[PDB]
Amino acid sequence: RPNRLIVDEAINEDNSVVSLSQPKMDELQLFRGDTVLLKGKKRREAVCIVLSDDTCSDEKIRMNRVVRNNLRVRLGDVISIQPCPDVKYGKRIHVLPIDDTVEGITGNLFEVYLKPYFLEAYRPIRKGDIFLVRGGMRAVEFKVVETDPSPYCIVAPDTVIHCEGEPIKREDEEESLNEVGYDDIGGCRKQLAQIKEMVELPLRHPALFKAIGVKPPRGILLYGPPGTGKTLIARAVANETGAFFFLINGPEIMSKLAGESESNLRKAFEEAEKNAPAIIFIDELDAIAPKREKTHGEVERRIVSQLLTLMDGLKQRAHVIVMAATNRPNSIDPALRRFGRFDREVDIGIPDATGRLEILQIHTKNMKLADDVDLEQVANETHGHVGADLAALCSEAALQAIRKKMDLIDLEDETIDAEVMNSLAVTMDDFRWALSQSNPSALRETVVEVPQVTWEDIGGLEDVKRELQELVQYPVEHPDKFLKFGMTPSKGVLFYGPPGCGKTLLAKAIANECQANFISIKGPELLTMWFGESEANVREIFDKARQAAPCVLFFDELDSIAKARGGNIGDGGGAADRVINQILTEMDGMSTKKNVFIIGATNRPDIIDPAILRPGRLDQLIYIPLPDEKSRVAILKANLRKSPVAKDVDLEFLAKMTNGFSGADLTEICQRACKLAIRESIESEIRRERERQTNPSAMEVEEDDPVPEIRRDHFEEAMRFARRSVSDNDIRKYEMFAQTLQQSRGFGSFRFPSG
Amino acid sequence: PELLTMWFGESEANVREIFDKARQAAPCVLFFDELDSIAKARGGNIGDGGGAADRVINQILTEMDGMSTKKNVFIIGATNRPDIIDPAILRPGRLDQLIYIPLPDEKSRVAILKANLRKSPVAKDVDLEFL
Ligand SMILES: Nc1ncnc2c1ncn2[C@@H]1O[C@H](COP(=O)(O)OP(=O)(O)OP(=O)(O)O)[C@@H](O)[C@H]1O
Numbered sequence A: 001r002p003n004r005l006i007v008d009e010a011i012n013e014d015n016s017v018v019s020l021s022q023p024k025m026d027e028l029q030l031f032r033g034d035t036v037l038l039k040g041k042k043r044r045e046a047v048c049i050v051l052s053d054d055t056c057s058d059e060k061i062r063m064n065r066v067v068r069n070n071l072r073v074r075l076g077d078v079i080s081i082q083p084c085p086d087v088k089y090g091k092r093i094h095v096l097p098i099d100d101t102v103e104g105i106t107g108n109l110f111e112v113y114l115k116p117y118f119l120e121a122y123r124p125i126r127k128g129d130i131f132l133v134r135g136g137m138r139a140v141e142f143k144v145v146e147t148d149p150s151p152y153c154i155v156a157p158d159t160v161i162h163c164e165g166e167p168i169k170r171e172d173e174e175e176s177l178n179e180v181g182y183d184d185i186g187g188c189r190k191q192l193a194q195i196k197e198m199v200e201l202p203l204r205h206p207a208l209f210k211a212i213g214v215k216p217p218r219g220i221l222l223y224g225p226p227g228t229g230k231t232l233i234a235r236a237v238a239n240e241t242g243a244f245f246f247l248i249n250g251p252e253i254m255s256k257l258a259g260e261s262e263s264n265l266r267k268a269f270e271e272a273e274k275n276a277p278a279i280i281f282i283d284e285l286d287a288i289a290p291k292r293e294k295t296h297g298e299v300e301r302r303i304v305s306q307l308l309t310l311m312d313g314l315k316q317r318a319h320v321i322v323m324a325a326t327n328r329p330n331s332i333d334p335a336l337r338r339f340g341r342f343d344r345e346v347d348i349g350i351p352d353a354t355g356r357l358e359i360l361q362i363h364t365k366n367m368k369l370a371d372d373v374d375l376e377q378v379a380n381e382t383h384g385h386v387g388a389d390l391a392a393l394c395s396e397a398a399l400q401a402i403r404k405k406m407d408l409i410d411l412e413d414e415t416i417d418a419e420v421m422n423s424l425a426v427t428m429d430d431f432r433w434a435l436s437q438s439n440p441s442a443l444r445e446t447v448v449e450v451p452q453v454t455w456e457d458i459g460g461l462e463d464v465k466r467e468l469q470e471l472v473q474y475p476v477e478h479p480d481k482f483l484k485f486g487m488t489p490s491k492g493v494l495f496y497g498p499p500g501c502g503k504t505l506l507a508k509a510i511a512n513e514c515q516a517n518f519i520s521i522k523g524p525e526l527l528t529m530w531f532g533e534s535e536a537n538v539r540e541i542f543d544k545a546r547q548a549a550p551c552v553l554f555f556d557e558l559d560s561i562a563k564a565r566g567g568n569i570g571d572g573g574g575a576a577d578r579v580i581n582q583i584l585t586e587m588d589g590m591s592t593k594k595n596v597f598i599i600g601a602t603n604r605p606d607i608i609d610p611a612i613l614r615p616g617r618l619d620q621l622i623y624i625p626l627p628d629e630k631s632r633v634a635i636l637k638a639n640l641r642k643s644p645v646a647k648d649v650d651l652e653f654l655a656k657m658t659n660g661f662s663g664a665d666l667t668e669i670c671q672r673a674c675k676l677a678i679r680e681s682i683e684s685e686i687r688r689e690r691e692r693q694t695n696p697s698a699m700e701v702e703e704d705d706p707v708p709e710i711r712r713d714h715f716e717e718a719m720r721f722a723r724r725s726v727s728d729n730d731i732r733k734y735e736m737f738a739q740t741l742q743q744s745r746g747f748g749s750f751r752f753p754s755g
Numbered sequence B: 001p002e003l004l005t006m007w008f009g010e011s012e013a014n015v016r017e018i019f020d021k022a023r024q025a026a027p028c029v030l031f032f033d034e035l036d037s038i039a040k041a042r043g044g045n046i047g048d049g050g051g052a053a054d055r056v057i058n059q060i061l062t063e064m065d066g067m068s069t070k071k072n073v074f075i076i077g078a079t080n081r082p083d084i085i086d087p088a089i090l091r092p093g094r095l096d097q098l099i100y101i102p103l104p105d106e107k108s109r110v111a112i113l114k115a116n117l118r119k120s121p122v123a124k125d126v127d128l129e130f131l
């Protein structure tokens, strides 16, 4: 029966869309823009407009929240769709605003909300429906309580609208909107899908899996920075799927006087079990269940034991599911990890770049913005923030925008109308001012992401590029060849050469190309850890790396550790021993199933311990040659890609004269030339100012002042202060180590043996 | 590396539990690795874990002296730098029987080659002797 359709989540947010595939259009021979009749649960009736969408399957109907609530149904149910061509243009419509939707407006609903939303829409409406309208910066619901014809009718230009009277009393099963939904979350699509897949089935079908007799999960942990929306996620899931959300807070429990707390806890569970399949969310667990050594008195231990017993004693039976929110999965007591206890754990990573953009779009939805708005730049510059941070920044930007208009917006009072405040076009001045008074929260926090470094960013070292491609991409792309041959790919790769010159650039480029997460470990912070934490810290670092598989781990200046071992002190070597032992133990603990490459950059391979250089550890050593002519030319071109042009010299000529210079030196030379150009522009502007004061308002057009390009004079200025970063003895020692390696693997030519 | 980690702090209980676990699983063959790492850290530019290393080795010696001949559990130690080893280990009752491992050659090389060359893609190969 290709007429009943299973309702699911939708893509179009318009109030009058039911999405059908083109074969479905062919099936019923329906028109586009025609009204169709929808029948569902609670004996509800709806009228809607058919729209085209090839994403939905033939048996799938895509349809938003407003009309889904109009039928008083949720996703996953079955509805009946039929043609309704007998609809005709409406005559009069009397609507009535909801009580808690128009507070603090004092305006003409016709000329701000009714006129634009109802314009050229032709949305069919039936008596009893509720429709939401976006406004200046608020969204307001209206309930159509009378219409001609009744109950179903067509919104037409020849309709008189009456929206005067006492607000209608709130309904009961109307499933009031303005609640959190799946769309209301940005930047966490992967985790959202992961949690949706393994939670929806037991709740939507409490008896189906019971008939299957497969034990569902009972406890899920969510950990991350505070204020990232974990409570928001839980509330949205409860609202969307349909459940009996029951929130309990740890500080509330701690506020009570001992025993009743536990009783309250008991009450909570006996509340949820008797109210059908329900969902329980508990927050700030470490605040009530920290590590047992952190626990000092006996009351907290009693509470912990009580909650453990309560949660274990409800093993399945009732379909209640509980999740918890915390900061990190390393502060709570470890006993809350057993089978049947909290076992499935999820991290909520910091939104970055794109996710920040969707967060802004979600928050910057209602208030009207100026055409100057450039959200992409804001998302680029803003990092180390959370959804709450961006919401606060948007709030303060709106406050600044309104504040500067007191004279125009009648600073006194007189209950400013909606259209007057509508004029507050948000400007980049407001955003910059808000950013001036801005404070991030994450800051000193590890970030896992995919960098955006391209292959053309470097001279190329095409042999090394191909070798790394062979090492990484093919093993995961085509495991069949290895499993047939029985070869296990290596894991630890090391680089050595002049300081810098692409190492980190190579790591970022390969991470970007392979489309895998990147984790960086720095020598300075390594030595910071070196005093104190040396065993646990590596443990959670590698646990985090394992969780983000597939990913690539990078180590910067590993020899710095041996720099403490071999240096001007040579006395704190116990910590270095601890670090090395931890690293080796973890490397031996790395299973072959995990696909995580490890890269290490070392300037001096000789000082470092050769014990690392063994099978099952870092084995592939790649030398870094100095940039040479064409490589230098490409590097200079990449540097010049920023803004100015160098159409006054010969780049390869300069490379010829500047042999033996690292790419870092070339970038520094470019920066010096840029500084000279900036100073030239500044002095040209100063001369313009001087001639302005000598003759007021003489001439103000743009003179031949330095615009973005590097003239030759700047080039001599830059080349004069050119640095030979690497001394010859450094090349001597690099080639000494290379020849040491070659002598071991030394077999002069061949003779085609066994011929 | 695990032993060197156990040098600082958690040493006594680990040794006791590992020897007890070996003892209850009799008969068994306890094995050791990096037996020269203790002496490698004993003499060098670190000079930090020497006290912990000496404590660990003393504990090991005492506990292995503490076993009863009833338990049919054997002990095997391996190293590649035997000179740096403390003579106290090379004592009666302690490790006394010593075996040198000569490098493979020809017959040994061909044997290890033909023992490791299982794989799926054997091709048809050539003479292992000249290899
Ligand atoms: N992806 C997002 N989309 C929309 N709003 C978001 C998002 N992430 C965070 N927010 C906002 O940040 C705030 C987070 O609120 P809330 O305290 O409920 O979150 P939380 O992460 O569960 O908090 P907690 O610190 O208690 O663990 C809210 O104002 C919410 O609107």
Ligand SMILES: Nc1ncnc2c1ncn2[C@@H]1O[C@H](COP(=O)(O)OP(=O)(O)O)[C@@H](O)[C@H]1O
Residues within 6 Å of the ligand: A457, A458, A459, A499, A500, A501, A502, A503, A504, A505, A556, A601, A634, A635, A638, A639, A662, A663, A664, A665, A667
């Ligand atoms: N376009 C480029 N081509 C090649 N090398 C580059 C380019 N841009 C920057 N580099 C190199 O990247 C290096 C970064 O240095 P640094 O991060 O301190 O050491 P490492 O690269 O070993 O991590 C610089 O020394 C510079 O020479």
